[PDB]
Structures are given as C-alpha cells and as structure tokens.
RNA sequence: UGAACGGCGGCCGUAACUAUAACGGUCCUAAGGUAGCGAAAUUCCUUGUCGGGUAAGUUCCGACCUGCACGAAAAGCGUAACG
RNA sequence: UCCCUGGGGUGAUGAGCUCCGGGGAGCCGCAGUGAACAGGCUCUGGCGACUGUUUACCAAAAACACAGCUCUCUGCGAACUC
RNA sequence: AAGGAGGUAAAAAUGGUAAAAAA
RNA sequence: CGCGGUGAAUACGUUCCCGGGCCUUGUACACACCGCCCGUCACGCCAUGGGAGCGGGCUCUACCCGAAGUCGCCGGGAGCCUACGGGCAGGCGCCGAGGGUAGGGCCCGUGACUGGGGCGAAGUCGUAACAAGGUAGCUGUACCGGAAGGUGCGGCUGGAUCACCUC
RNA sequence: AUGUGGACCCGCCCCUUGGGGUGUGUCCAAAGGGCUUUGCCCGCUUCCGGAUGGGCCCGCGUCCCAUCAGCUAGUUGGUGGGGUAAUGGCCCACCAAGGCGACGACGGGUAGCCGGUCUGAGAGGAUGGCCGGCCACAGGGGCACUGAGACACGGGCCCCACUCCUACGGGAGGCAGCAGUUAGGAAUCUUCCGCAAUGGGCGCAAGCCUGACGGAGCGACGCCGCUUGGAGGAAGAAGCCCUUCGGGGUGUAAACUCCUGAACCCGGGACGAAACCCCCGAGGAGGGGACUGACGGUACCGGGGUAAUAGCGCCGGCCAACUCCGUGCCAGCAGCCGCGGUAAUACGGAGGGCGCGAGCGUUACCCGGAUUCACUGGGCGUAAAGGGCGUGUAGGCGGCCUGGGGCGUCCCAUGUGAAAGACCACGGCUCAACCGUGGGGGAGCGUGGGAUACGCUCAGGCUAGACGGUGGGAGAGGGUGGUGGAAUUCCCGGAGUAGCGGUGAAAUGCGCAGAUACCGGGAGGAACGCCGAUGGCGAAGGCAGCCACCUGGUCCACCCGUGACGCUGAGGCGCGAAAGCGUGGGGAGCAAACCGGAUUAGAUACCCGGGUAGUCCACGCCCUAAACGAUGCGCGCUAGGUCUCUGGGUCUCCUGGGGGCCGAAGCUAACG
C-alpha cells in the first residue's frame, strides 16, 4: 500500500542523501517511482539495505512502458445526437471523415466545413471532444 | 408591592419631566425627602411638601422647566435632563473617596448616601466620606 | 440576564478553532507530496494548484498549493506547509514556498522573489 | 367473500468518461411480492465476492443480494428465559 | 490444640443437658470438606418462546403439546357425535 | 352610502422552457 | 398606390369572448415567469455517525509471588565483641516497588459493510414552494408514494374578496 | 566524674491548648591544637537571647467539561498507643455512626505558581522563557542511611528498562550541571580564556576547588546609535521609459568641480583594584608601604589619509501612489470583495512613483478593532431566541416608622506588600538603547478607632402591598348521573315506475331481482340548529342543547379583621389539541391506508362511487405543535376619543374590574 511508500521516501531521504549516484525519478505515464542507477549489484545491494535496516515490503517489479495507440484506416460514421430532453435539446449531428497518417507526424484536423453548416463556435470546440475522446482509447 | 419606591419615584420624576406637568406625587419616606431636598437644593425641582391622599401620607414634587422657543415646534426645553438609578437592588454600589463620579465632566451631580447622610458629588467628595451611589442626574 | 443570572452562570468566551491546523505552532512543514492534477475555482476559472500531500512530520495529507508559475517539484521538494486558502481548490491551506529544499522560484522573476526563489538578478552590465 | 384453497410476470430502451437505471416504452394476465430477512434447516453454479477470526479456515460470526427455488398466519421479523 | 466469650432451648431467669455462634494466640504434614457422595467454565450463532409430550424394541428432536391469536359453526330438541 | 379594520360563502383544462454571460 | 359616380343598415346596452390602459394587490422575481426553485437516483472529492471486531493509552477493583529497606519481635542446642546488661551477625513477622491472573470503566486509533451531510460552469426524472402556482400556505401527527410530495384527524395565519353582521 | 544549667517524672503558684516558676528523686558534660608559653590566638563542654532559613496549620484567591451526580468503611470522631523537632490516624488497637456534595462534590481532560508581560480608553483578555521568589523532578519507581538540615543530580541499597566494557566466569554508567555529538523539528550557538573583580566551601594565615561569576566568539533574533557624502552643477546632455512628433519624464540625478574624510597606517595608551598581606600600636580603632588584569594595546587620546555596500513589500477600493507591450477564464495574483473569458491600472514584464531602508515581505502564535459572550457595554412582536401552561422548593431580592447592632459599606491611623520593572526627578557611558540614585502613588488582607445615611440583624409598631369576614354577581370554567328534538344510514309495512346518482363534463355506481322520491312505526350512534357575538369564562391546551349534584377560578360594594404573611420561582410537581398506543364495549354520519372511476404524457394526487383504522365510552401510557398575543410574571408611573360585557350607586352621570379599535408623548431598523 502507498502508505509504506512515502515511508520508503523517507528511506530515500537518507538514501539519495548519502550516496550521490542514483536517480529516484517517477515515470509520468505510470505510477511507482523508478529507482535508476549505474550498476546491477548497485541497485541490488541498495535494495539489500532496504529490507535490512529500513525494512520495506515492495515486491520489486518490472518497469512499465509508455503505451500509446492509433488506427490504420479511413472511417466515416454518423455522430448524430438526435436527443431532445426538456425542451433545450442540446443535440449535435456531426459528420466527420477521419484520416490517419505516419507514426511520427503529429496531430491534424481541418477547418473542414462542407460550406457553412455547423456554427463557428464549435470550430474551436467540436474538435475538443475529438481531442478529448482521445486521452483514453 | 414595590422593590424600590425610590426608583419608582425617580421614574415618576422622569414622567413629569417628560410629559411636562408642573408637579407630580410620590409616597412618604425619609429617604425620598432627602433626595428631593438635594434636588431643590441644587436648582432642579420646584419644591416638595408632606401631603396626603385619601388618608395616606404622600410627598408631592413640583418641577422646573425653561423658556418657550420657536421654529422647531413650541416645546420648551428641560432642566432636569435625565436621572439614572445606579445602585440598584442588585447593583449595590459602594463608592468612597478616590472613587465617586464626576458627572458630565464638570456640571451634573452624584447623589450618594453615605456615613453622614445624603450628600452630592462635590459634597461627599469634600466631606471625604462615601457610601452607596444612589443615582445620577443632570 | 439581570446581574444575578450573570453572576451565577456567566457568558462563555468566544473560543477559536484554528482554521489552519498545520499544528505544533508549526507553519512550515516538510511537504513530501503525491499527485499533481489541476482542479478549478468556482464559476469563472481553471488552473493547476497541485495537491501536495506532504505528511508534514506529524500527520495530515493537506492539499499544498504552490507559488504559481514555474514549477518542477516532481514528488518531494519539501513543500513548506504554509497556510492560506482562496476561492479555489477546497483547501489551498498550507502552501509551498520555492527556495526551501526545491523549486527556487520562476525561471526569471522580477518581483515576488520573496517566495518566487530568484536571488538578485545580477545581469552583469 | 383471501389469519377461505390458491396465485402473487416478461422483454426493449434510457444518467455528458465508463459501469448503474430512479426513468419512459411494451406483450401478458386475476393481480404482479408491500414491509422485514437473505449464499438461510431455503443458493444449482459455490469452496460466490468481501471482512474478521488462523501458521493455514469448503466449517464459523458479520456483510454484500442475479433470492436456480425467502417473505406474511403451511405466517414474515425479532426476542431476554428455558433447551 | 488452648484462652476468652454471645444469644435460642429445657429446667426456674441455674446446676446440669442441648442448639446455633464470635474472637485471639498456638501445633503438624505433601496436602486438614485428608477417605465416599462432588458441578468444568466462558464467548457466538441456529431453530423452537417457555415446565413438558411422542414412535414400549435403534430415535427425544426444529416434529406434537402448550398459555395466546384469528377464523368460523351453536337460539336449546343446541351444533357436533355414536 | 367614505375610508380603514373584524369574522363568513367566491373565483386558475393543462403546462415543461435552459443558461456562463453583457451595464 | 392614388382618384372618383351611386349610395346604406345600425349601435339598446357592458351580461360573457379577445386584448390594452390605469389603480389595487401579491411577491422567495432584479437583462427580472422565456425568473427562481426542491428531493431522490448518478460521477467524484471531505470529514462524520453507525458497524462482526481488531489495535492501544490511562485508570478501577479482588487476589498470587515479592527485592531493598523502615518498623516489630527473637538472639533459640551456634557465630563474634561482651564494657555480660546487652550489642553486632542472623532468624521470623508488617508495609512494600515491581511482575502475574480474572473482571471492569473511560478515551483515541480503527474496519468488510451501512445512514446521512456538505461540496463540485451546465446529468436524468418530475414542479412542490413563491401570483388561489394553477389543489390557500404551514405544522403536530399517523398511514402512503420514484422522489420533491400526498392525505385523513387537529391546529395555526405568516391565507383568501362582488360583497354579507359590527367597529 | 565536676554540675550555673538543661531533661523527665508526681505535687505545687501564676497561667490558659504543651506559657513561666517551684517542692522530691535520678541522668548528662568537655578536646584539646598551637606559640612570642604563665598569657593569648583557633577550637571544646552546659544552657539562655538574638541574627537566619525552614516544618506544621488555618484564612483567602486559584483552568475546563453537567453529555463528569452522586462520593467515602482509614472512612467522619473519640479514648488509649506509635512516630516526627512536634499538632494531628500519618500508622496499631478498640469503638459511635457519621464525613463532602448543584455554594458543583466524584470523575476525567489540561496545567508548575508568582513579582511580573503584551494588548485594549478602560473593564479585561491572553500570558509567566532571560531575571527574582516559592514548588517539584533527578532515566522510571520503591527506599532508607548519614546528619543541623535530604529521601539527597556529579552519596548508598533494590526492581525496571537502556546502553556499554570482558578473556564472555563478571562488571560499569546518567550532559533536566557545563562546552560539545546524535534522534528530533521550519528553526535555538564556541568541544574558548581568568579566579584579576565579586560571591560560595574550607584553612590562623600564605592559600586551594569552583564551566558560580567575570570576559571574548556566532546568528540582523530584539531594541539603540551610524558611514556610503557634502557643496557648485543643464530649459535638463546622452543612456532607457512615453508620444498627438512639438516634446514629457527619468534627475542636480550623472559626468566635470572643490570640500571634508568610514575603512585603513604610524604613535602613545586605559578605568575596571585595593582591600587581603607584612609592619607601630594590643591581634582592637587607627597609621604606612608593598602584591594583585582574563579581556588586550581592545577603549580612547594624537597625527596621515582613501568617497568608500543598497537594497525589500507595493502602485484595483480598505491603503499612499499609472503609463506602455505581452499574456487571452490559459499561464495566473488574491487577507476581503474579486480580477483576465484577445485594446488586464489586480497576471507578467519595462519607466516612473508610494512605503520602508540595514533592512522588507510571508506564515504561525497572542491582545485589539470585536461594544462580535456587552460589568462599564447587548438583547428575546417578524432578523438568533420565552420555557405549551399553572405549582412549589431553595435561592434571589424586597412596603411605611421608632430605636438598639455596627455584619456589608464609608472615613483616617496603621502592618506588610522585598528587590526589579512601572512614574517623575537627578545622574553614568561624548546621545540613545541601556544602566546609577532619591522619593511619592499603589490594589490587597491584618490590627485601631470612627459614621450609621443604605442592604441586612435585633425589639416594638402602622396601613397604602398580601390575606381573611360579610354581602351581593357574571359565565360554552371542569368530574358525574339524566333527558329533548332535529337529522343521516338501516329493519318490517304501504304506495308508486323509467330512472337516479353524481359532476367542469362524464363515468365507476345503484335500477324492471322494482332502485332515487313520499307516508306508518322501531333500531342505533355521534354531534348541538336559532340564540350567538367583532361576546363570556379559563393559568395554558380548551369550553356550546337543557335538568340536577359536587367544585375550583375570579368580580364589585362595606372598612369589620390580620399586619408585609411580598414579586419571581434553577430542579422536583401536576397538566394537556389532534393524532397515536394498550385491555374491553360500540359504530349512524364520517374517512386517510386501500379498490374502482375520470383525468393527464404520468395521477401512487385534487374531482366521483366504495371502504378501514380511527373519530364515542371507561381505565391506563404517551406529553408533542404556528400550544401563536410568535409578546414570560408582579408593581407603580405617562393624553384622551370611542365600541362593548360585567360589579355598585336615584343614574341623559360617575366609578371598579375586563374585553376591541384609535391615537399623546414615548419607543422601533421599519411594518408598528
């Protein structure tokens, strides 16, 4: 439990302050602070000193990876929000074509109005929910 | 009934002084005689006497006023501005020498009952004897 | 309450509550931390403000803020538990300081260098 | 006429992450299980999922409830005293 | 064991005889209700409320009983029952 | 017939409509 | 759009339909009824009560063992001084810190699960309250309902006016 | 042994808690050392008196939670013992039931207390570190010993941990003394010098220990003083900010000018300390000479002389100070309100200016503004708040008058309140911060006398309060038994037939199996029409046909009685709408829950047909509210107009008690 964690952070508070060397830095995309250093036996024996005289229960795990994702094809669907409620509606039928491109480009969308349908207030917002429904695949 | 005919008197005073009625009555007692004595003795009331009503001893007091001004209504001003009972039957004040009020920083009067009789502020101060702080008037 | 009743009972004194229990008479505590996030103030805002959880050196998980623009902090820093909420982050009590054991203020600051780290802009000219 | 024998549904959708469904639709019948209790002397999957208890716990107490197939006098619930 | 002593009884308001009792010191062993009769205790569930009754010859039980409750039949030649 | 006040009888088929905001 | 030949009916009345104006009035409304506004159920955050119990701090009593020491007594078939009377060493006995056992009492930490409360640019459902809010409101209550709420018995105005009996 | 004396014992005189003497009988002493020796110095023995500190005791004040209400069998008391310097159960024994508590006991959280300290006009709040007094602790606990004094920080014994030394047989140690390490925390220092000065312990002295004390070091932690410069110096250069291209600003600020002269160089150089000491006298008073500095050659005096550090909060109103670009509800500031959502005086930058300056902001803690726990100094008709209403205990307080008391209170004498600080005054260091010295104010309790006005105490008295007597009087004021009619559903009877019912409309419903409607008699319950009201009674909740019984509340007249019997009343007491509950009786009407009907998207609701609990009785329990005059009770006072119910009077009027409205003054923030 992460209660023993900030505890082991005091442990580091006298580990990364006695031997310079190592870097106790946390990966962003995942939890758990990465104990980085220069040596196999290095981290191993520093780990010895842990359960020895600092006594920490941490099933010493494998480092995680920063996983992203994408697609591989042109898709066309109906984003119709045909939903009236109280009378205020809030309904949105959006018609997107989606195109995918190289592993390394960036992010692209286009000021793509078929002529002049969807309001210009959605131009800097209809794409948000696109960029929003993108933080989780 | 009553719990301080004294205060009820000072009250009837306030009554007459406010409602403007040349005189008003208030029952017989030595202490009130002493009080009204002080009042007349310092240019406040208009006088007193040992009267009777229905066969019951009373003490009536006539009281002072001033001139009739114009403009803001005819109401003539008051001389006996206000009085407040200080040493209530729960506020049993016991002033003395170094103590004693200075009533409206100069004028006024501290009515106080002391070892030797009923003295006023300048009086009881001069006498160098204190006691209970009856009321305040100006 | 006629003098009597006031004499018997009394009139109980105000008594505070300390609307900032960093406690110990200690208002500077050694902010460990965990989590960063963002959160927002009421109706017309949206920002960052951390949550630094600190542990002080005697308890409490707080929600340590920061001195605003220009942070690094990662996850230790010794965020100096300070004290003072605002209409934002339902807490903002016990802030962070920069300089402390981490942060040292905005990369280039010209005023609030009393918290915002930066020493004396000695532009060498 | 139900402290008379009895019986006391199903499917479709819907909460601005998700999951849920107070909520609308909908065929059926006489009517669709109210309160309380619930892996029960009732639970098939089951040694359910959780918590405690233990060195370890299909047993046990407590709790969650998709009750295969609790539930109103073939009574429901709970209860100190006896067994 | 020994010293001190209280009241019920009987006789008389006591000697004797009896009943039940209190205190203080002192003696011995492994332990003194010295042997025989003589209860293990507590926590928490389940069902049944309760003492009970029942399958003599495998059952004692959560089954039946029970005080209590509703429901109904009975106008005296009762109704019920043979 | 004046007002003001005190106790008795009257009169709405239905209505859901949001909101950060602009001075 | 403008201009002209001919040439009416009928308005008693304000009973009811439409609206405006003004006054009154009600008000929890204030780019103000195209206003506000409550309660579940929903997502998250924060303490909190409860909860089979676990953890622990203090303290409570009854009892078992019991150091040092004070005190009390003995010094006996014996030890040493004895200035024999005693003394000292020692012997047993009282209180006694401490630990032990069982049962309390109080407090905090706490835990599957569970009630509720707060909060958070806009969720879903209904519209109760504020104009008689479209059923006068509001409450004590007892039964009911998705939820705000409903309703009987009662009470209370902070409820009700063509015009009915007075001041 | 010697015995002025002290100690006990039994008497005795005086006392009055164990104060002093005294008659009888027994016990105790002594240490000697020095030398200038026949004398003294230092010490010794026995007691008395002071000087000085403490022991015990009471008086008194002394945080909070009432969701801490009862506590106690060494417990309250005695006699008789034991012990201490000694009073006392502090402990033994024996014994009689008492000992404290809403004046907050018991419990438990919290805490050293003070002379003082910061703030507020003050009341007071909070506070107690350096210093000065009293307490308590010695790693925790027990514990004695020694002794004039202890339960003894660097003495002893034991248990407990805890750490260390060893050859693992055994043993040691306490920095809450002083410097210094470490854990701890945002943070609290030198492992220093001298006993020269003072002070303590000892020695006849010389002298000796003294991390007491007296000095330097470190940290802007506090307060004080102080240099970075003076003086000339431009319609004002340029450098940079701003612009309407004219300039405005920055700023005499700069530079150039002359002047002085921190730092620093040489020289001399302190006070802080004269006693102790030897010497004449006697070892006394007095007299003389001589020794004695850690700081440090620092202070300071003289001369030579260099211009020689500048920062920190801010510029949206509180709060003094705005212009320019960027940033665009993003990055962000914020103690309050809030400010930015693409021209921000609040972000962020740059010029300027506000503040302060060897310092400024930030947070935390404390007092104030906060009169926002109100004693000065508040409030309860609608903002927060009358207890649903009467009862009564204690408690609180109290009518007119005489005199005694002299408790509260007032007066002056007076003890102490140390010192220090607080104030003024004088002074010391060249000022201040800071320290030297004088004096008064000073709460407060002790003791003396004095006043008696006011509360209270004491005795006597009065009638104006309270109460009683008699006599009339009003009422839906309660407990009980009794009885009248109307009217609703229902039973038998009779007569009649095409519908009624019900509603916004309708329908569920009842109807040719003879209903709704009317006539005859019987059942049965519950509520009282008109009167009757804007009224009456009642402490509130309540009370409604009328008879009778018992029975409280109150009203006026008469002045007949008593003589302050008084107002309120924390708890305790009783009471109580409707609902609701229990054990029984009863049910006409009524009606939630429940069913049907209509209605609407929905109708678990209002509207319609049914129907139950219940609404009734006795008895018991619950005891709640918009119990609403939302206004506690009791007294007296301050205009009157009017509507009315009741009491008395020869009465187109008065007067007592009540019930509505109006409106003086007066009150309110206003409606009122």
From Swiss-Prot, chain A:
Q: Where is the signal peptide?
A: none
Domain of life, per the record?
Bacteria
Subcellular location(s) per record: Cytoplasm
Disulphide-bridged cysteine pairs:
none
* Family per record: Belongs to the TRAFAC class translation factor GTPase superfamily. Classic translation factor GTPase family. EF-G/EF-2 subfamily.
- What does this gene product do? Catalyzes the GTP-dependent ribosomal translocation step during translation elongation. During this step, the ribosome changes from the pre-translocational (PRE) to the post-translocational (POST) state as the newly formed A-site-bound peptidyl-tRNA and P-site-bound deacylated tRNA move to the P and E sites, respectively. Catalyzes the coordinated movement of the two tRNA molecules, the mRNA and conformational changes in the ribosome.
- Protein name, as recorded: Elongation factor G
Name the encoding gene, please: fusA
Curated annotation (Swiss-Prot), chain B:
* GO MF terms held by the record: rRNA binding; structural constituent of ribosome
Q: Report whether Ribonucleoprotein shows up as a keyword of the record.
A: yes
Please report a single Pfam family linked to this protein. Answer: Ribosomal_S8
GO CC terms of this entry:
ribonucleoprotein complex; ribosome
Keyword rRNA-binding listed? The answer is yes
Family statement:
Belongs to the universal ribosomal protein uS8 family.
Protein name, per record: Small ribosomal subunit protein uS8
Which organism is this entry from?
Thermus thermophilus (strain ATCC BAA-163 / DSM 7039 / HB27)
Q: Give the encoding gene's name.
A: rpsH
Curated annotation (Swiss-Prot), chain C:
Provide GO CC annotations from the record: small ribosomal subunit
Molecular functions per Gene Ontology: rRNA binding; structural constituent of ribosome; tRNA binding
Task: Give the start-end ranges of region Disordered.
Answer: 105-125
Record's keyword terms, sorted: Methylation, Ribonucleoprotein, Ribosomal protein, RNA-binding, rRNA-binding, tRNA-binding
Any one Gene Ontology biological process term?
translation
Q: How does it assemble?
A: Part of the 30S ribosomal subunit. Contacts proteins S8 and S17. May interact with IF1 in the 30S initiation complex.
Name it.
Small ribosomal subunit protein uS12
Q: What is the lineage of its organism?
A: Bacteria, Thermotogati, Deinococcota, Deinococci, Thermales
